[PDB]
């Protein structure tokens with residue numbers, strides 16, 4: 001008889017010939033066994049591409065585990081995962097709104113190891129077996145923005161923490177206006193406002209700039225396990241052309257939280273043969289995906305995404321349920337797809353990341369505040385439930401700017417050092433309030449240029465610069 | 473022995489002569505009972521309120537009243553609901569610490585009031601009677617700040633037919649008469665905005681312009697305030713609508729919000745409902761004196777706006793705090809307003825459902841500043857706990873009713889950009905066809921909203937209007 005265990009060695013079940021925990025851990029055990037048998041049999045790369053061969057090797061892995069005498073060690077923490085099960089059972093109903101039963105997926109990951117400590121597969125496996133933590137793929141919407149746009153622009157030294165971006169009206173190449181909610185745009189805006197409010201236009205110019213600088217955006221995303229088939233898409237940074245599991249996407253956030261270092265997500269740490277020989281064991285392959293300056297600058301922006309409360313009530317929800325816990329150093333980001341079909345809230349302290357999705361299995365609209373309110377309230381309860389079952393697991397550490405970060409005094413108005421600039425004839429002495437801007441390059445921000453923001457048409461600049469000029 | 477009872481007859485305390493009932497409840501109810509006996513004794517003796525103006529006569533009648541209750545056979549019936557009041561004492565004891573924000577021990581006052589009677593069902597008098605006896609529900613007077621706005625500014629203007637729900641006001645930079653800018657936090661202003669936005673964000677300049685309009689129309693603003701029992705010594709103050717020159721108890725202020733919530737009909741606050749002598753003489757009994765302060769159309773339009781103050785969550789996390797503690801209660805029909813004095817010395821949050829109004833203030837006894845989020849967050853979280861404690865003790869007390877527009881309300885189709893009906897306007901030579909998005913705007917007059925004219929907003933300079941009209945013609 002084979003057995004699957006929790007991280008401490010406690011048997012989950014034995015395998016032979018009714019919850020997520022079983023089928024998820026079994027499924028991944030079987031994946032690891034498949035790689036092992038394919039390697040053991042020296043099956044070539046090209047054979048493994050053949051579908052009849054996959055079927056055979058999948059069936060062999062299943063049988064091997066039924067018939068072998070394997071001990072399979074998972075990353076799962078029995079008390080935590082258990083408390084998450086109870087949390088979804090007790091508080092799942094918070095997610096229901098006008099729109100039918102709202103399904104849900106959550107993944108609690110260790111930021112230092114990528115191990116998964118526990119998860120919510122859905123509202124109630126007995127009613128609905130689909131696994132919303134591991135199998136469901138949905139656009140991550142604006143939770144894309146920190147990873148693929150802003151993070152990468154900072155890492156490449158093309159922007160800093162208080163850099164300015166255009167949220168002026170602009171159209172996609174088809175002539176349609178880029179929209180956010182029901183707004184065509186406003187004007188210039190700091191990266192912090194862009195992120196707190198989740199505006200779309202800033203993210204659109206950010207990606208566009210990366211593309212014009214020839215930046216290897218695919219390299220970044222692939223080092224995190226992301227598979228995006230087409231990068232040549234205007235709305236990519238807003239979630240367009242991307243679909244991900246909660247498990248994979250929680251790994252993107254783990255990378256930001258873990259100071260820019262990726263660790264591959266996993267639920268199985270080891271498989272042992274009857275005799276004791278290691279058939280599979282998880283090997284740490286940390287990767288510095290974003291520089292420490294970049295990750296830690298982003299941690300600071302993401303802390304404010306939550307404390308500003310603009311697109312999620314979370315910090316308020318949690319404060320009411322557990323004010324001590326609410327004082328941990330939470331950072332995060334919300335997502336909402338275009339018709340409110342899917343909501344995401346990703347949360348991290350320095351120790352842990354908690355990814356969260358909700359939506360309907362057949363992809364129809366949630367209520368309008370499903371993500372802003374319902375999901376945030378639910379997650380605050382989940383997060384409390386994890387705390388009760390494992391009271392120091394969240395930790396009390398703060399995120400903190402790496403020493404390699406560079407600090408620049410810049411004009412609040414331009415995101416850039418004070419300077420002479422040419423404004424149509426007349427050269428101006430650009431003056432006004434300064435802020436500390438954080439950069440992940442060598443030299444900090446540049447001097448103020450005419451084209452000071454990320455994005456913006458001529459007209460936009462004319463407009464922005466006349467108010468700047470207006471207040472000197 | 474005289475006796476002070478809860479509303480149901482349970483004895484709060486007996487009153488004897490002192491040698492030569494350690495709580496806010498005791499002193500508060502005795503203090504009002506004595507005032508009631510004072511009025512009765514002065515009348516019984518037939519003393520004029522030119523005589524009652526003389527200060528030895530006051531002293532005499534106060535001393536007389538105390539002894540009357542000390543030595544007499546009096547049953548005093550309070551309005552205090554025991555199980556509710558007791559839950560509120562437990563709530564401030566258990567959750568009071570949520571208020572301490574680094575600036576010291578933060579003091580607190582609350583009053584729960586029945587909107588259809590003015591009866592005070594319970595109150596919190598401070599953090600802990602034993603530690604500090606100042607009664608922060610009944611005695612303490614502080615500026616109500618921006619919770620002044622709905623009563624003294626927007627509600628009167630709507631009542632007077634001078635604005636409706638989607639009317640536009642100037643938040644453009646303007647100065648006080650002394651030349652200093654009118655500030656809101658660190659902002660010197662923005663541009664035009666709807667009433668609802670003005671209310672959600674609590675901006676100052678729209679409120680200044682609103683009261684200036686009432687003055688210019690010679691509205692009897694004092695008449696309104698005084699019918700709700702407010703005593704403001706000086707109305708000629710530019711910052712009155714923002715709370716400049718007004719100081720109120722929590723108990724009085726709750727009564728103003730009880731007016732708005734009860735469809736514009738005031739009932740005077742009271743904690744004493746009846747005093748009888750052992751011999752049958754009913755010395756005092758509370759008489760209902762309804763006063764229609766705002767029209768029902770005004771009060772119900774105001775309710776709609778204050779619903780959104782809370783649910784927008786701009787100046788208070790209350791609806792979020794409460795959702796997490798009790799989602800079912802959070803779905804009751806909450807309306808309300810926040811206030812913050814200019815150095816964060818005093819935070820107010822006023823809450824209603826159709827049945828009840830709960831007033832709340834926090835600050836320090838010496839008036840120093842709280843932290844910056846004390847009102848936005850700490851007070852809102854504290855009060856969600858309080859509201860929830862009050863519910864658990866009396867599960868139906870908040871009610872499931874909804875606020876709703878009175879059928880006398882007048883609905884108008886207006887431009888979102890102007891708050892006024894679509895049509896032609898003269899913009900500097902060019903007569904222009906004003907077109908665009910419309911909303912339904914609610915009024916409390918006969919004929920609804922006017923046609924758009926050049927000066928479409930409450931407030932604004934020539935410059936401001938140039939700039940807003942400039943913006944409007946790029947749409948069309």
Ligand SMILES: *[B-](O)(O)[C@H](C)NC(=O)c1c(F)cccc1F
Pocket residue numbers: 139140141142143179180181198199200235238239240241334335336337338
């Ligand atoms: B974001 O706050 O989730 C914002 C609403 N993002 C989007 O608009 C967006 C998607 F969620 C998915 C594809 C494209 C897109 F612009």
Ligand SMILES: *[B-](O)(O)[C@H](C)NC(=O)c1c(F)cccc1F
Pocket residue numbers: 615616617618619656657674675676711714715716717810811812813814
């Ligand atoms: B309001 O949101 O409380 C707003 C801040 N009000 C004021 O600034 C204000 C006062 F609270 C008191 C007197 C004047 C004044 F402008």
Ligand SMILES: [Cl-]
Pocket residue numbers: 019020021022085121
């Ligand atoms: Cl499970």
Ligand SMILES: [Cl-]
Pocket residue numbers: 006007008009010076077078079
């Ligand atoms: Cl375990």
Ligand SMILES: [Cl-]
Pocket residue numbers: 215216217218219231
């Ligand atoms: Cl790429």
Ligand SMILES: [Cl-]
Pocket residue numbers: 225226227228243244245248
């Ligand atoms: Cl992926």
Ligand SMILES: [Cl-]
Pocket residue numbers: 230231232
């Ligand atoms: Cl490409």
Ligand SMILES: [Cl-]
Pocket residue numbers: 028265266267268269
């Ligand atoms: Cl795994």
Ligand SMILES: [Cl-]
Pocket residue numbers: 288290291292293
């Ligand atoms: Cl680094």
Ligand SMILES: [Cl-]
Pocket residue numbers: 307315
């Ligand atoms: Cl916070």
Ligand SMILES: [Cl-]
Pocket residue numbers: 309312313314316785788789792
């Ligand atoms: Cl909130």
Ligand SMILES: [Cl-]
Pocket residue numbers: 100360361362363
């Ligand atoms: Cl469905």
Ligand SMILES: [Cl-]
Pocket residue numbers: 321380381384385
């Ligand atoms: Cl909880």
Ligand SMILES: [Cl-]
Pocket residue numbers: 399400401
């Ligand atoms: Cl830091």
Ligand SMILES: [Cl-]
Pocket residue numbers: 407408409444
């Ligand atoms: Cl510098």
Ligand SMILES: [Cl-]
Pocket residue numbers: 157441442443444
């Ligand atoms: Cl550099």
